[PDB]
Amino acid sequence: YAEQGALSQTTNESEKINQAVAITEMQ
Amino acid sequence: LVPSLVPLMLNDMDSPITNDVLEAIQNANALQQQNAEANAPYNQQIQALQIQKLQAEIMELQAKAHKYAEQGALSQTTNESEKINQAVAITEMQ
């Protein structure tokens, strides 16, 4: 369960990086 | 207080059976403490094992709370990305 939570944290971080580059791909 | 007084009571008896009763008490106490010190490793093993079980429950519930909190944060982030997709789809429409 702890490693599943860490995996969820890492894919949350990758979705955040995808948003942080999609805001610059928009503008 | 009563069962701790009966050897001190029986030491003060003028009966001829007293020397038999006292060694019977000594043999019973020796057998009782022998059984107690023979069964005590199993008791401390059960104690340590129950302590480890109750600690395993701590780490289990903490790991469940951690994974549920990170799943909620993941849901928040994908909600934000769907919101950004809508906020650019309204301008792709117009």
Quote the distance between the C-alpha of residue A4 and its chain's center.
15
Residues in A closer than 8 angstroms to B80, CB to CB, are 19
Contacts of B74 in chain A (CB under 8 A): 8, 11-12, 15
The four Cα atoms B43, B45, B50, B52 give a dihedral, to 10 degrees, of 160
Give the number of other CB atoms < 10 A from CB of residue B13. 11
Elucidated via: cryo-EM
Exposed e or buried b for every residue in B34-72, given b needs 16+ CB within 10 A? eeeeeeeeeeeeeeeeeeeeeeeeeeeeeeeebbeebee
Q: Is B80 on the interface with A (CB under 8 A)?
A: yes
Give the experimental resolution in Å. 3.6
Q: How many other β-carbons are positioned within 10 Å of the β-carbon of residue A12?
A: 19
- The H helix count followed by the E strand count for chain B is 2, 0
| Cβ-nearest to B63 among A1, A15, A18 | A1
